Design a protein around this ligand. Sequence first.
Ligand code: NA
Ligand code: NA
Ligand code: NA
Ligand code: NA
Lengths: 192, 193
Amino acid sequence: SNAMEALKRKIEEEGVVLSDQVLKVDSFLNHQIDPLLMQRIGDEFASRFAKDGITKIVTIESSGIAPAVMTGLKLGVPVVFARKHKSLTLTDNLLTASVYSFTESQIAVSGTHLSDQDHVLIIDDFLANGQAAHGLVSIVKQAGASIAGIGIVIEKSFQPGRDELVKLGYRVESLARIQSLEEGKVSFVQEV
Amino acid sequence: NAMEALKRKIEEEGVVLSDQVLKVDSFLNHQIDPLLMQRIGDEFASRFAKDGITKIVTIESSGIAPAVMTGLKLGVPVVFARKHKSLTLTDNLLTASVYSFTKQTESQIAVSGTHLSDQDHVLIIDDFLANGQAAHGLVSIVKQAGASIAGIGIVIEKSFQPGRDELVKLGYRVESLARIQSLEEGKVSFVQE
Ligand code: NA
Ligand code: NA
Ligand code: NA
Ligand code: NA
C-alpha cells in the first residue's frame, strides 16, 4: 500500500531481467510512465525530505523527470532537469559536468535556475555506477548550492554507485534496492 | 484558471528572443513549475474527460511533465517517444520522420509498439506547437499501431505558424492553452478567442 510495496510489485510483475546488469522497466518507468505510481513515488520522496528545507529538485532528462516533478509537486518546489544534448534555449550561464559510460558525454544546467541560496534534492530513476549522480552533484556544487540528498527510484545495490555517494557523505534514499539480477530474477536487498 | 495562470507566467517570466522564439526556461523547458504543470494537466483532462481516453502519447523532454500531469488526472498511462537510442528501447519499434523547417534537417523518433494497442484511443500532449512536425510524427506512430487519436493538447501554440491549421485540416481536435498571435517587437500578444 506504500510506494515501496507498489514499486516492488510492479518490478516483480512487469520488470524484465535482460542480464546480470540490466533490468527492463519500460512498461512503467522508462518509456511508458505510470503517473499514479509516479505520484506515490514523489509523495514518498517528499515525506523523507519533508523537514529538510528543500528549495529545489534537480534531475536529468528524460526518465528522471516524472518522479522529480511529482516530488516537486508535493514539496512545493521547482524542478530543474539537466540536459544531455544541445537544445534551443539552453544557451547561457551553463554549468557542465562530464559523464562517462562504462565513452564520455556532457550534461548541463543553466546557473540562472540554481543559486547558492538553494538546498537541493537530487532525484533520478536508476542508480547503477553513479556517474550521472556525481555529475549532478558537481553541477549543484558549482552553483554554490548545498545538497540535501539523493532520491532514487531503483537502485542496483550490487553496483558501486550507492557506496560512492554514501562515502562522500550524501544521504541516499532508494525506494527499490536490488541485490541481484542473477538467474534472470530480481532479488531485493533483505529487510529485517 | 490554467490558461490565465499560464498567460501571466508567460507575460511575467517569458523572454522573447529575436522577435520570434519564446524562451520559457523558468517554468516549462528547463526549470519546471510542478504546480502550474498540474493545473495544465487538469485543464487538458477536463477538455478530454468525456472522450474515453485510454492513453497519452508525448515526446521527450519538455512534453513529459504536462503529459504526466494530464495522465494522472485522466487515470491513464503516458508513453513518451524517444529521439535517441535507449538501452532497452528495441522491441516493436514504430518510427516517424520529423523534418525541421527552421534548420532544414530530418530526424527519427520512436515508440515501442508493445505500449500501443489497436484498442487505444490516444490523447497527444506536447509543450509547443509551431510548425507541427513532431505532432504529425506522433499522429503517424499512433496510426501505425492501429490506434485512434482523440485529439492533441498543446501548452503553447504559436498561432502565426502553420502547425495548428495543418492538424485541424486533417480533422484533429487541437486544444491549445496559450495561443500566441504574435511575438513581434519583443512582446507576447495572445489570441483573444
Ligand atoms: Na536517469
Ligand atoms: Na534511466
Ligand atoms: Na515538445
Ligand atoms: Na519544446
